[PDB]
Design a protein around this ligand. Structure first.
Ligand SMILES: NC(=O)c1cnccn1
Ligand SMILES: [Cl-]
Ligand SMILES: [Cl-]
Length: 163
């Protein structure tokens, strides 16, 4: 574990993270995809061997000794708000299990289902709160990666609020 486990946020490409492992915002079929998933495919292509996994689950594949945790959030175009919310909460619990099993002291994580799986809605608060619910009982340093300046401010505010 980290000596004083923390949350931080950075506005940059998760493929350039400074953490001991990465969470991919994966699709269920282990395809290169777009956004975070395409950047992860270009940086750690070996991690996409047998990475396919259902919605609401996480499956880790090593690229050398560097763990890539493929987490499949729901596509809110396809799910009801209720079922999508349940699967988004489940994906993050599976991420906490994997981070714990790996024994890492740090993890780089994107906000699941906030991009092309958002169903055109702002899900910053919904996705971040499910991230906190899952990761608060872990002792890894968590670094959240985002791309938008307004999102960075709102994530930073939510972290600082809890102290
Ligand atoms: N996570 C992000 O960087 C982000 C930015 N703008 C909309 C949705 N997600
Ligand atoms: Cl960058
Ligand atoms: Cl997404």
């Amino acid at each position: 574990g980290a000596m004083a486990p923390s949350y931080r946020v950075k506005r940059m490409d998760i493929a350039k993270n400074d953490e001991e492992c990465v969470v991919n915002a994966a699709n269920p079929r282990g395809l290169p995809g777009d956004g975070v998933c395409k950047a992860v495919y270009k940086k750690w292509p070996e991690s996409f061997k047998n990475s396919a996994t259902p919605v609401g689950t996480a499956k880790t594949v090593m690229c050398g000794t560097y763990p890539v945790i493929h987490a499949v959030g729901p596509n809110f175009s396809n799910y009801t708000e209720s079922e999508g919310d349940r699967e988004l909460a489940a994906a993050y619990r599976e991420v906490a299990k994997e981070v714990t099993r790996l024994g890492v002291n740090s993890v780089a994580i994107p906000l699941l289902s906030t991009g092309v799986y958002s169903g055109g809605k702002d899900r910053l608060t919904q996705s971040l709160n499910h991230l906190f619910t899952a990761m608060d009982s872990t002792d890894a340093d968590v670094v959240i990666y985002c791309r938008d300046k307004e999102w960075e401010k709102k994530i930073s505010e939510a972290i600082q609020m809890r102290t």
